[PDB]
Design a protein around this nucleic acid. Structure first.
Lengths: 187, 124, 142, 258
RNA sequence: CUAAGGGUCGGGUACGAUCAACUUA
RNA sequence: UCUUAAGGUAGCCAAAUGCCUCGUCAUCUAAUUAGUGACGCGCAUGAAUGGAUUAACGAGAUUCCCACUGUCCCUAUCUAC
RNA sequence: UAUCUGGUUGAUCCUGCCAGUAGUCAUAUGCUUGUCUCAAAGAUUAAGCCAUGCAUGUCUAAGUAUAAGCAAUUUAUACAGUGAAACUGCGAAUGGCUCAUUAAAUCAGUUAUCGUUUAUUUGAUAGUUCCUUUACUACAUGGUAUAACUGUGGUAAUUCUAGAGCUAAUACAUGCUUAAAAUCUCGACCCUUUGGAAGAGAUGUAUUUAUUAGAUAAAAAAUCAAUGUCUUCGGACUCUUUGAUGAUUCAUAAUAACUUUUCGAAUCGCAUGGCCUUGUGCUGGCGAUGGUUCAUUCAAAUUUCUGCCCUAUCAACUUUCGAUGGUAGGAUAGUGGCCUACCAUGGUUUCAACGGGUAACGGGGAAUAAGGGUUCGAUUCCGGAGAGGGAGCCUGAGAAACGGCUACC
RNA sequence: GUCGGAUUUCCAACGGGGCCUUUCCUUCUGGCUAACCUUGAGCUUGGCGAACCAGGACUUUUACUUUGAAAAAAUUAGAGUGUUCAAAGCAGGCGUAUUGCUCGAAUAUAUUAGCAUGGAAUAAUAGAAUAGGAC
RNA sequence: ACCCACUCGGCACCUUACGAGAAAUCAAAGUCUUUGGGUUCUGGGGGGAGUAUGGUCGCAAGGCUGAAACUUAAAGGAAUU
RNA sequence: CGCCCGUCGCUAGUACCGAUUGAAUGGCUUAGUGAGGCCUCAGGAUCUGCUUAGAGAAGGGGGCAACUCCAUCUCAGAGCGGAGAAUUUGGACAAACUUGGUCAUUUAGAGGAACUAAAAGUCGUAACAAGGUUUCCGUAGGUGAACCUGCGGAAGGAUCAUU
RNA sequence: GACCCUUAAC
């Protein structure tokens, strides 16, 4: 089947190599998951040594982290808007590692309200006590809050859905968000 | 498979077959000692070759070399034990001068001849 | 060596987080390591901006195994150079030697400036590309 | 080979087992166990060839099947359990006790140790780590894992076990001027008394050792087993005390003290 | 659907909206 | 040996030049007065009355093959005038 | 055992071959049925084709037997002996054979894995599992398609097969019981004056972020809008916790979380000892088999550091479609153009690349030797490859297995 | 005077080591205080350092040393051994006649790249030349 | 411009001469079995044969590179008579 | 009266050129066609609650006009709590063809042109002596054959030599 | 001046 050996590759001098052995099991490859969105479907793959591996197709939700806030929550994925490897992955809405995606932004927004509770723009007693201590920290970044009006957060996914069966990621932040915003809104 | 059983030759044929001086001496040797073959002389000269080769390599090494101090003494004790070279030497001398006549003089065919129980090498 | 973010993907050191909440001088904290074996981490690597995941100092490769020196015969690949290792091979029959060379392609971090003619030290790393197993860790040019 | 080998030809077994060329074509493959393949002595070749308590592997299995032999206190009812260096094995018939030790020439000698001596064994710590839950542990040369070691002990030290529990009763550090055993290399079986260790940052630390006869030699660090301080070793040494007599003086000692 | 390929300015000592046509892949 | 001013050289050929002739051998075919290759005492080849060759070119002679087909086996049918 | 000798001339000295000579774990063959030990043996041609018969099966005190199998009951009226089958488990990936392919490719010296392990062995290690949750309540312990076996079967035929009724589940939503203590998160009691309660939960292991983490060479002082687990609004500002490597984002913590239940023993044998208000009720001892994780062992995969015969009658080679490098992803057990999305012509080459040949598997070695060498090495050991030729794959820890399967030739 | 037998001082090439001769084998952290006229009986109750020590990016670059941490076994060379000898094999040997004990299974770069406080003789594109040099 | 004496460089010049060589002979053809200053090219019995299935240069003539089958006991060098 | 060269003729052998587009065999196509596995989009034979007031053939508190978490063998549009064979319904590994390229003396061929040998053959006599024109080299032309001739060169010459 | 040749037959 799909092989990972170097024996079929031309040598560094350019010489074509003669066949030395048949394809071996330990040097095999497999077909990609090509993970899509919707109605989660993960097929188990048996690998070397037992060692089950979960191949995600058509995944719905994912656990995404807000690094500057130290929080992560389960959240469905709207779709991928940018992929460095190939633009067809964006068009097909394929979920592979490092894909830029938009997430629901709602569990973060509702956590932001129940953790900081500050007013965008211009309560219990134990709530207000924790509110005061957590003040002077609810002004993270305009480029992030502007995404909360539309209810969608730009994010990277850092897990490998075809390997672990999971779509996990983090919200785009800081200079990284400005880099991809520049490419996303580029003419 | 089981480990191979090693084997080695014991005799060596002379380079030039029809040597009048060598042919006469070897058949002269067989008569005086009652040997049945020339191979019985070839092996003794082959055995002597391994001995002269051993002492020659040892003697190229310097005096008080641990190799010849151990290997030379061992060769002396083995050769003295079998009586080929004289026992009143301690100088690693006779080994390179050992002649063919010395080895087959110590064979039992002639050993029982001169011990008086045989009366002839052929009778022995 | 002109732009860090000249790529389609954002270039960064993995798991090295600069919190946008905090705001101090030298904001973008850069991770580096000592390669060991007495090699000195260049100043260009400590306060450089390049990312180079294959850099021996600011990347995720570790130097271990053979350490070699050679003369740079090529610099026309991006972050990769070819060094020439000239040696003498003994032919016992003639009791003398013949000149032999091997080209080894090694990775050169933007922490170093390398041109053809320099003498570099390379340390073995895990396979970095199809042909590369070595990383430049020292350059004999000023 | 598509998978692990299970046979071991003769001429491919380790030389120190003292096996002959003929009378069979398979040498006893030591199973997986505390000691490596090459640096181990199978119980089959010990009980049979070392002592002649048995004439063949069938009859060693008869010896084994009745739980008479036990190494480190545990029975080991199998033909090819790899008993290795410094392992203590016991034959409860007449209370015969054995410590698998190296002789001068690099082979596993046969000891006779007492009961209080057979209680303890010496293990060289191969590495020091902490496992799950922050619990520290040390891996010995025979694959034992001992949780909660003394924090003072590092790699290349020697801990002594009690073989009735898994704890470390005592230990000895690695430094200059400590009695050591050579386990491997061409200096196998020589007792060393460390004088210096040169590092070579990046691989194969070398140690210089001189025995009682003022003969110095160098061996890799992985071949050094510390066994005590100056004077008293922690274990009973074999006959000859690992002094490496030369062939000339071994020839003399064989002649006089037959 | 995507990519590539152009024209027009105010300089305290690398910057942008404009605007524009059919050739390729 | 007789004879010519000289007795056709280098080449080429059953050639658009060979009568005999459908020359002989080979190849091509099931079968070839065709074609090609080759060969000789060439009716009557042959050197600017130019010889031999020759890439490219040709509504120029010719032979074969693949393709293709109503040229044919074996005709049938349709349209306009 | 550092030899040479014959042959060109009428004769001589040479050059130079031919021939002789000796060996051959080099083969064949010629000439022979009377000796001891030892021993190669369908490699060369045909990795050609195979009739037949064997070459992988497997049980303990201890996973299942009511065999309608054979057998003295009072230790065998639940079974407790032996025991054909069948299930389950393990093994069949070892072994053995052969040398076709294969020319930096195998291989050899066994560098590295800080680039990936866990039939197994050995050692260690899981008080966290009423997940419809302060018992509103089975663990003195919730079931089932089907094997054996009984039963008229079908087919010429095969180690072909559902057709009617029990077992191990370990097969499946299979599924409980062990508060602990500490920390963290949120908080249902009155005008609080640093508010302070119980209360509700979470925190075992198995899969992304971010980190006070994972530190560290040697001295005394200033300043923090929202007032330091303490004090009399100027006292101590006090060991403060920190393991390894040459080196790490290492080991291992801890914090959001995520996990479509991974595991976290409803299993088995022998032993029935003992305080008791006679109930398995308080506890029982050896063990067998465990499924997880860590280490260990046996292994596997992956590189070129250097090294390979002849050939220029092979000088240029690498040509959407990889061909050197970059970035990212996918795949993989894992690294890696291994594969997928771009520039630059990147990489190799007279120090011989790339082609061609090999009556080429590599090596340990063999024969032959004054010293240097030359030739050989199918073959007892090691490594590789293959199972008529290709290709693909299931199971399994491990195979691209062929005395496993699938397909084409 | 260290056994048919031998003692360094009236003699060997001494192979090597350290110190002076401009000569130098990088010098400084301190809990150790080392060779130094800081000293209790013919020898230390205050100090200068390698027969002792962790704290410097820096032992020009190499080839060629000697030295060996290593040719898997088998094989080869080779030690011992009463296979009857030998090829071979790794065995065996010896008793209080009757108990038991004991030696072995050594040891050796026939091709080439890592380490080596001791080796710079041999042989090169290394340093300070419009000083950018050293202390 | 000649003559003597030097000297450097050059063309050369008298011997079977220490040495070398098979000898012819050799101011190098010596310092070479007492075998090593540096370096390039070429040969390995005679013939087939400097004959291409090839390649390359040349207008051509040809140059350069360059076999095998097969067949031989010699071919050859320098002397002597 | 030695030796000795070439053409030509007869035999034999070896190799070469050569129309014939067979070198029929022997590794892959940036050509075609896709066996079979594997992944995947679907597909759905096959069965757990067999819970819905049917069912004057089961006792049911009352003085039988549908009052009870109930009935066979008939079954529920209770969504719903589930596995799952045949079925290329796309890919990827890779395979099902009178077709270009190359080759381990590697096998045909009219004819052509060499070489070698044998040979009691024909023609001359080119070379070896100044070989009767010294020989030889390179080159060009010519001629039955050796060979001759032109031009330049060599001595390996038949001259180491002239005033 | 001209001058070619020479056994298969021990």
């Amino acid at each position: 089947g799909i092989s990972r050996d170097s024996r079929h590759k031309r040598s560094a001098t350019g010489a074509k190599r003669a066949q030395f052995r048949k394809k071996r099991k330990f040097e095999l490859g497999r077909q990609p998951a090509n993970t899509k969105i919707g109605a989660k479907r993960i097929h188990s793959v048996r690998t070397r040594g037992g060692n089950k591996k979960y191949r995600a197709l058509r995944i719905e939700t994912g656990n995404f982290s807000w690094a500057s806030e130290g929080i992560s929550k389960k959240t469905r994925i709207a779709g991928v808007v940018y992929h460095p490897s190939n633009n067809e992955l964006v068009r097909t809405n394929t979920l592979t590692k490092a894909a830029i995606v938009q997430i629901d932004a709602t569990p973060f927004r509702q956590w932001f309200e129940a953790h900081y509770g500050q007013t965008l723009g211009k309560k219990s007693k134990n709530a207000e006590r924790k509110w005061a201590a957590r003040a002077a920290s609810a002004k993270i970044e305009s480029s992030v809050e502007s995404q909360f009006s539309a209810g969608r957060l730009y994010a990277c996914i850092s897990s490998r859905p075809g390997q672990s069966g999971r779509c996990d990621g983090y919200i785009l932040e800081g200079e990284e968000l400005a880099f991809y915003l520049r490419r996303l809104t580029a003419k | 498979p089981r480990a191979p059983r090693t084997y080695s030759k014991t005799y060596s044929t002379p380079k030039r077959p029809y040597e009048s001086s060598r042919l006469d001496a070897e058949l002269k040797l067989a008569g005086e000692f009652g040997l049945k073959n020339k191979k019985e002389i070839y092996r003794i000269s082959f055995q002597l070759s391994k001995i002269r080769r051993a002492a020659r390599d040892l003697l190229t090494r310097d005096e008080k070399d641990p190799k010849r101090l151990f290997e030379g003494n061992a060769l002396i004790r083995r050769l003295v034990r079998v009586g080929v070279l004289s026992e009143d030497k301690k100088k690693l001398d006779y080994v390179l001068a050992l002649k063919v006549e010395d080895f087959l003089e110590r064979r039992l065919q002639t050993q029982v001849y001169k011990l008086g129980l045989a009366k002839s090498v052929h009778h022995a | 060596e002109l732009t860090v973010q000249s790529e389609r993907a954002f270039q960064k050191q993995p798991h090295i987080f600069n919190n946008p909440k905090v705001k101090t001088s030298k904001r973008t904290k850069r991770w580096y390591k000592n390669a060991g074996l007495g090699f000195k981490t260049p100043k260009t690597a400590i306060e450089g901006s390049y990312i180079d995941k294959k850099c021996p100092f600011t990347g995720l490769v570790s130097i271990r195994g053979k350490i070699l020196t050679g003369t740079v015969v090529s610099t026309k690949m991006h972050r990769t150079i070819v060094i020439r290792r000239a040696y003498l091979h003994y032919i016992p029959k003639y009791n003398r030697y013949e000149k032999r060379h091997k080209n080894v392609p090694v990775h050169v971090s933007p922490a170093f400036r390398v041109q053809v003619g320099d003498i570099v030290t390379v340390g073995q790393c895990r396979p970095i590309s199809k042909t590369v197993r070595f990383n430049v860790v020292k350059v004999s040019a000023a | 080979a598509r998978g692990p080998k299970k046979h071991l030809k003769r001429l491919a077994a380790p030389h120190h087992w003292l096996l002959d060329k003929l009378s069979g074509c398979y040498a006893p493959r030591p199973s997986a166990g505390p000691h490596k393949l090459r640096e181990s002595l199978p119980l089959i070749v010990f009980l049979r060839n070392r002592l002649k308590y048995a004439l063949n592997g069938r009859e060693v299995k008869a010896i084994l099947m009745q739980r008479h032999v036990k190494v480190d206190g545990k029975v080991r009812t199998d033909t090819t359990y790899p008993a290795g260096f410094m392992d203590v094995i016991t034959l409860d018939a007449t209370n015969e006790n054995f410590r698998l030790v190296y002789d001068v020439k690099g082979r596993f000698a046969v000891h006779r140790i007492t009961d209080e001596e057979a209680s303890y064994k010496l293990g060289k710590v191969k590495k020091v780590q902490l496992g799950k839950k922050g619990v520290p542990y040390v891996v010995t040369h025979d694959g034992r894992t001992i949780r909660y070691p003394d924090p003072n002990i590092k790699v290349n030290d020697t801990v002594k076990i009690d073989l009735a529990s898994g704890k470390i009763t005592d230990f000895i550090k690695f430094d200059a001027g400590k009695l050591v055993y050579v386990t491997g290399g061409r200096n196998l079986g020589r007792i060393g008394t460390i004088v210096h260790k040169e590092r070579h940052d990046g691989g194969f630390d070398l140690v210089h050792i001189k025995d009682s006869l003022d003969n110095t030699f160098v061996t890799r660090l992985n071949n050094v087993f510390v066994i005590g301080e100056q004077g008293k070793p922690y274990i009973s040494l074999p006959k000859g005390k690992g002094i490496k007599l030369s062939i000339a003086e071994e020839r003399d000692r064989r002649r006089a003290q037959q």
